[PDB]
Design a protein around this motif. Structure first.
Motif, PDB file in Angstrom:
ATOM      1  N   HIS B  34       0.839  -1.185   0.000  1.00  0.00           N
ATOM      2  CA  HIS B  34       0.000   0.000   0.000  1.00  0.00           C
ATOM      3  C   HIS B  34       0.879   1.242   0.000  1.00  0.00           C
ATOM      4  N   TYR B  36       0.467   5.201   1.210  1.00  0.00           N
ATOM      5  CA  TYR B  36      -0.345   6.165   1.935  1.00  0.00           C
ATOM      6  C   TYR B  36       0.326   7.530   1.901  1.00  0.00           C
ATOM      7  N   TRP B  38       0.317  11.245   3.783  1.00  0.00           N
ATOM      8  CA  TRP B  38      -0.052  11.817   5.075  1.00  0.00           C
ATOM      9  C   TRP B  38       0.369  13.284   5.089  1.00  0.00           C
ATOM     10  N   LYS B  42      -3.637  16.576   8.441  1.00  0.00           N
ATOM     11  CA  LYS B  42      -4.620  15.658   7.881  1.00  0.00           C
ATOM     12  C   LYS B  42      -4.455  14.273   8.510  1.00  0.00           C
ATOM     13  N   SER B  43      -5.054  13.263   7.890  1.00  0.00           N
ATOM     14  CA  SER B  43      -4.934  11.865   8.259  1.00  0.00           C
ATOM     15  C   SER B  43      -4.270  11.109   7.119  1.00  0.00           C
ATOM     16  N   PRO B  44      -3.676   9.949   7.394  1.00  0.00           N
ATOM     17  CA  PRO B  44      -3.124   9.138   6.302  1.00  0.00           C
ATOM     18  C   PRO B  44      -4.217   8.770   5.310  1.00  0.00           C
ATOM     19  N   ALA B  46      -5.145   6.743   1.595  1.00  0.00           N
ATOM     20  CA  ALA B  46      -4.707   5.660   0.726  1.00  0.00           C
ATOM     21  C   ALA B  46      -4.566   6.154  -0.708  1.00  0.00           C
ATOM     22  N   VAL B  49      -3.155   0.413  -3.823  1.00  0.00           N
ATOM     23  CA  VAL B  49      -3.037  -0.923  -3.256  1.00  0.00           C
ATOM     24  C   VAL B  49      -2.670  -1.844  -4.407  1.00  0.00           C
ATOM     25  N   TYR B  91       3.349   0.675   2.964  1.00  0.00           N
ATOM     26  CA  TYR B  91       2.770  -0.348   3.825  1.00  0.00           C
ATOM     27  C   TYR B  91       2.858  -1.688   3.109  1.00  0.00           C
ATOM     28  N   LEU B 100       2.314  -7.186   9.309  1.00  0.00           N
ATOM     29  CA  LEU B 100       1.922  -5.871   8.812  1.00  0.00           C
ATOM     30  C   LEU B 100       3.071  -4.913   9.115  1.00  0.00           C
ATOM     31  N   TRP B 102       5.318  -1.516   8.381  1.00  0.00           N
ATOM     32  CA  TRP B 102       5.253  -0.152   7.883  1.00  0.00           C
ATOM     33  C   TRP B 102       6.651   0.370   7.576  1.00  0.00           C
ATOM     34  N   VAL B 161       6.310  28.959   3.919  1.00  0.00           N
ATOM     35  CA  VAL B 161       5.879  29.263   2.555  1.00  0.00           C
ATOM     36  C   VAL B 161       4.477  29.869   2.614  1.00  0.00           C
TER      37      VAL B 161
ATOM     38  N   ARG D 146      -9.265 -10.126  -2.968  1.00  0.00           N
ATOM     39  CA  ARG D 146      -8.572 -10.627  -4.157  1.00  0.00           C
ATOM     40  C   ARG D 146      -8.135 -12.077  -3.956  1.00  0.00           C
TER      41      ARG D 146
ATOM     42  N   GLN E  43       1.132   0.011  15.371  1.00  0.00           N
ATOM     43  CA  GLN E  43      -0.183  -0.577  15.568  1.00  0.00           C
ATOM     44  C   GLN E  43      -0.353  -1.020  17.013  1.00  0.00           C
ATOM     45  N   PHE E  88      -4.904   6.986  15.880  1.00  0.00           N
ATOM     46  CA  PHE E  88      -5.680   6.876  14.657  1.00  0.00           C
ATOM     47  C   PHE E  88      -6.414   5.547  14.641  1.00  0.00           C
ATOM     48  N   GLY E  97      -7.455  -7.488   1.376  1.00  0.00           N
ATOM     49  CA  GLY E  97      -7.360  -6.895   0.055  1.00  0.00           C
ATOM     50  C   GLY E  97      -7.380  -5.380  -0.018  1.00  0.00           C
ATOM     51  N   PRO E  99      -7.694  -1.144   0.943  1.00  0.00           N
ATOM     52  CA  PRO E  99      -6.922  -0.154   1.696  1.00  0.00           C
ATOM     53  C   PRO E  99      -7.622   0.211   2.997  1.00  0.00           C
ATOM     54  N   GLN E 100      -6.900   0.953   3.827  1.00  0.00           N
ATOM     55  CA  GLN E 100      -7.404   1.392   5.120  1.00  0.00           C
ATOM     56  C   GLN E 100      -7.897   2.829   5.021  1.00  0.00           C
ATOM     57  N   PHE E 102      -8.733   5.991   7.394  1.00  0.00           N
ATOM     58  CA  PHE E 102      -8.352   6.467   8.715  1.00  0.00           C
ATOM     59  C   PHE E 102      -9.370   7.469   9.245  1.00  0.00           C
ATOM     60  N   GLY E 103      -9.450   7.560  10.568  1.00  0.00           N
ATOM     61  CA  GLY E 103     -10.304   8.530  11.215  1.00  0.00           C
ATOM     62  C   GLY E 103      -9.674   9.906  11.192  1.00  0.00           C
ATOM     63  N   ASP E 104     -10.158  10.771  12.082  1.00  0.00           N
ATOM     64  CA  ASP E 104      -9.661  12.138  12.146  1.00  0.00           C
ATOM     65  C   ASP E 104      -8.552  12.313  13.172  1.00  0.00           C
ATOM     66  N   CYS E 168       0.285  31.556   6.510  1.00  0.00           N
ATOM     67  CA  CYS E 168       1.211  30.471   6.813  1.00  0.00           C
ATOM     68  C   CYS E 168       1.381  30.413   8.324  1.00  0.00           C
TER      69      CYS E 168
END
Lengths: 100, 199, 11, 271, 241
Positions: B34, B36, B38, B42-44, B46, B49, B91, B100, B102, B161, D146, E43, E88, E97, E99-100, E102-104, E168
């Motif tokens: 994967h 990602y 980030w 913000k959040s990661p 996708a 894949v 990922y 898993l 990273w 910037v 998949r 994780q 997160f 299979g 993708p993930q 993510f939350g806020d 900025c």
């Protein structure tokens, strides 16, 4: 729920010859579910140390097992196989015929 | 073997240029990969894949490829834009998804093409509630670095910037302040770009 | 050999 | 002509489920796994896999235990699909493998829940066939993972490669053919009828054809074929019987066809 | 999508915690992550199926549950300061299979004493007249100082609308006393407009700092004000001269 009744075959591994060692086979097949009780009998009493093959099934998903024990048949000993299943209202007993 | 390498660790590219970075993983013991993105605050998110060798996946100006025989995946960004500034994570699920792993991530920073720089240090008017005087170092070249401060009481932020969208103008800026009485703005950022305007 | 089970795939 | 097949049987026990797995090359078992052992472990059942070493069997044992843990969750998911209580035992079965063509000929991965078909991998190895709506939940899950390309990778590649390796390490036993030993038994049934039973013992592989003939015409509609049984030593047994009148036993001939025979044999009751 | 709450939280050491995240997307996979400077994403726990839970890389101190597919709570029975992190929650359609999503994010701050929580003080500094003469542009500077923890959001508001052009803000705050493990922070931001725009007295400039501090349910025994979640702003008007 699906239930299949077992098919029993009692036979020896080799052509039975009096006084020579052999294996007594009980082949239960075509039954469902897999839970089954099989005992080999010698003159009407269970043989203490009977082994069986690993659980497998056929194309129609019906299970089969081979219960065997080493034995030496004589002219007067009568062997049989007693099998109990959920599809059987009472234990089925199939006697062994050599001249079949 | 369960290790994911991401190269380069950090990279700076001017806006409008194109860049790529690499993700390395063991060829064997591979299941999926994967990508990602980030962005700061913000959040990661996708991006891709990929699970097949030779997979080429394109989303806008961002494309990626996967080489499972050599254990490599390349992420391409054509025509870099300020929004592309983010940490890109690799990922790599391994051991039939039982591991898993990273990556360390490749941090992308897009630099503005500051042509016609006008480096200068200005003093901003104070507020009735503030004891500190505020200095502003602005309009300096993109390759100028604002080192920290050598005075405890003097605080200095990093470059920033600033993008004036409507005028198609961008400007780097850094702010310094202190409540000391022996603190001037022409003696606050003491490698300045030279020819720096001091009003 | 046995087919590799994937962590997370069920019925 | 040559095949490798694995058989999974997971049965929930309300009174942990029991996962039993076996592997076959043609008609020869070579591996067995039982989750109810003291320390469950993939075990060899043929000599041509006992020589594989610890790294081979440690990897196999890992996969069996991983599949057993997975089939436990699947048993609970399936129970939820059909709104079944947790006081009843249920069965999840899986059979997959590959068939060798002249140079993969066909690959397959089919499953069953409580005896009836559930889901099966189509022959193109890129789609599935679901039996009921519950299996369509399973199909959508596997499509999202998949899982089809994972099985295509296995069936077209790993399964064929290791099937060839097993057939070579055990060509002495696997690529041979045991001709059936045959005889005919005669038993009276009435004062006007008698049973002729044609025997075929100790043959390998199990595929065989036993047919009775009257005056050269196939008497198969009147033949009772028994299920081919395992002898217990690696070979198989089978018999075919027909009921004939007491004055025409010499009009019936038995014909046995097997790979181990150079030509199909023709048998007859020899009084 | 993945609804994770709360976005910010300040708790005392030992007071039980539950960070919630839910999804109604029929996602089989849900996992909790935490990101720390120098350590990256790690994780904590993950769930591949309903009523299936497995430990992540750093599961010590956390517990999770998957009684129903929609929810995957992160429970801290006795939170300790080392668990102060950015969390997160993520979900995937299936565990293998897809993708993930993510939350806020949850910026959790576990402190030994709530007496260290301070709201920010905001001040605006009007542009330099030398910059106006030289560059024909005007840069304003907003300073948010003396706040703890790092739970702030700075925003510029021109004439009642939030503006991002010509803005900025510092990506990271500065510790006012860097030799402390509890130093209050200082943040700076810049809004740059044309000289003509700053010279219009009808233009209203305001920088707003949203402070995510305590709640009204929290206990405050100090003589000063309870550092509740609040907004502190500073404003400046256009100047014709």
């Amino acid at each position: 729920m699906i239930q299949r009744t077992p098919k029993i075959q009692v036979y020896s591994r080799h052509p039975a010859e009096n006084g020579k060692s052999n294996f007594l086979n009980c082949y239960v097949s075509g039954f469902h579910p897999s839970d089954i009780e099989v005992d080999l009998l010698k003159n009407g009493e269970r043989i203490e140390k009977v082994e069986h093959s690993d659980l497998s099934f056929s194309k129609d998903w019906s299970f089969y097992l081979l219960y065997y024990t080493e034995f030496t048949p004589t002219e007067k000993d009568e062997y049989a196989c007693r099998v109990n299943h959920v599809t059987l209202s009472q234990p089925k007993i199939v006697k062994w015929d050599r001249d079949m | 073997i369960l290790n994911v390498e991401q190269s380069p660790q950090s990279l700076h590219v001017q806006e409008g240029d194109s860049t790529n970075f690499t993700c390395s993983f063991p060829s064997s013991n591979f299941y999926a990969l994967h990508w990602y993105r980030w962005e700061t605050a913000k959040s990661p998110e996708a991006l891709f894949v990929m699970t097949l060798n030779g997979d080429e996946k394109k989303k806008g100006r961002i494309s990626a490829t996967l080489n499972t025989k050599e254990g490599y995946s390349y992420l391409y960004i054509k025509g870099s834009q300020p929004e592309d500034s983010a940490t890109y994570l690799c990922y790599v699920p391994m051991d039939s998804n039982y591991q898993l792993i990273w990556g360390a991530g490749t941090k992308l920073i897009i630099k503005p093409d500051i042509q016609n720089p006008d480096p200068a240090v200005y003093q901003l008017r104070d507020s009735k509630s503030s004891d500190k005087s505020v200095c502003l170092f602005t309009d300096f070249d993109s390759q100028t670095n604002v080192s920290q401060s050598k005075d405890s009481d003097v605080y200095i932020t990093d470059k920033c910037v600033l993008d004036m969208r409507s005028m198609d103008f961008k400007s780097n800026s850094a702010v310094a302040w202190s409540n000391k009485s022996d603190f001037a703005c022409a003696n606050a950022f003491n490698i300045i770009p030279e020819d720096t305007f001091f009003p | 050999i046995l087919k590799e089970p994937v962590h997370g795939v069920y019925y | 002509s040559h095949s490798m097949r694995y058989f999974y049987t997971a049965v929930s026990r309300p009174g942990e489920p029991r996962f039993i797995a076996v592997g076959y090359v043609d008609d020869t078992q070579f591996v067995r796994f039982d989750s109810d052992a003291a320390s469950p472990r993939g075990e060899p059942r043929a000599p041509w896999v006992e020589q594989e070493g610890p790294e081979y069997w440690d990897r196999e044992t890992q996969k069996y235990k991983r599949q057993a843990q997975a089939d436990r969750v699947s048993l609970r998911n399936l129970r939820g699909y059909y709104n079944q209580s947790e006081a009843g035992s249920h069965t999840l079965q899986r059979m997959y493998g590959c068939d060798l063509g002249p140079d993969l000929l066909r690959g397959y991965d089919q499953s069953a829940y409580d005896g009836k078909d559930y889901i099966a991998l189509n022959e193109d190895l890129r789609s599935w066939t679901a039996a009921d709506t519950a299996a369509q939940i399973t199909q959508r899950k596997w499509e999202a993972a998949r899982e089809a390309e994972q099985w295509r990778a296995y069936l077209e590649g790993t399964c064929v490669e290791w099937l060839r390796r097993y057939l070579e390490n055990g060509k002495e036993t696997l690529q041979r053919a045991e001709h059936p030993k045959t005889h005919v038994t005669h038993h009276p049934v009435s004062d006007h009828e008698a049973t002729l039973r044609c025997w075929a013992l100790g043959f390998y592989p199990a595929e065989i054809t036993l047919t009775w003939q009257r005056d050269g015409e196939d008497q198969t509609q009147d033949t009772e074929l028994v299920e081919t049984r395992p002898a217990g030593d690696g070979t198989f047994q089978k018999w075919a019987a027909v009921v004939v009148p007491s004055g025409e036993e010499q009009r019936y001939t038995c014909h046995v066809q097997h790979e181990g025979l150079p030509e199909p044999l023709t048998l007859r009751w020899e009084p | 999508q993945v609804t994770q709450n709360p976005r910010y939280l300040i708790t005392v050491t030992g007071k039980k915690l539950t960070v919630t995240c839910s999804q109604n997307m029929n996602h089989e996979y849900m996992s909790w992550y935490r990101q720390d400077p120098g350590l990256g994403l790690r994780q904590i726990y993950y769930s591949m199926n309903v009523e299936v839970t497995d430990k992540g890389d750093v599961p010590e101190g956390y517990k999770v549950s998957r009684k129903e597919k929609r929810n995957f709570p992160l429970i801290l029975e006795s939170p300790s300061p080392n668990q102060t992190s950015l969390y997160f929650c993520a979900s995937s359609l299936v565990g293998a299979g897809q993708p993930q999503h993510f939350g806020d994010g949850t910026r959790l701050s576990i402190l030994e004493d709530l007496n260290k929580v301070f709201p920010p003080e905001v001040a605006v500094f009007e542009p330099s007249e030398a910059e106006i003469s030289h560059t024909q542009k005007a840069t304003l500077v907003c300073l948010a100082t003396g706040f703890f923890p790092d739970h702030v959001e700075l925003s510029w508001w021109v004439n009642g609308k939030e503006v991002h052009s010509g803005v900025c803000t510092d990506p990271q705050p500065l510790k006012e006393q860097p030799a402390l493990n509890d130093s209050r922070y200082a943040l700076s931001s810049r809004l740059r407009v044309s000289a003509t725009f700053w010279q219009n007295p009808r233009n209203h400039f305001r920088c707003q700092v949203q402070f995510y501090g305590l709640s009204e349910n929290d206990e405050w025994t100090q003589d000063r004000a309870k550092p509740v979640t609040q907004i502190v702003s500073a404003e400046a008007w256009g100047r014709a001269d």
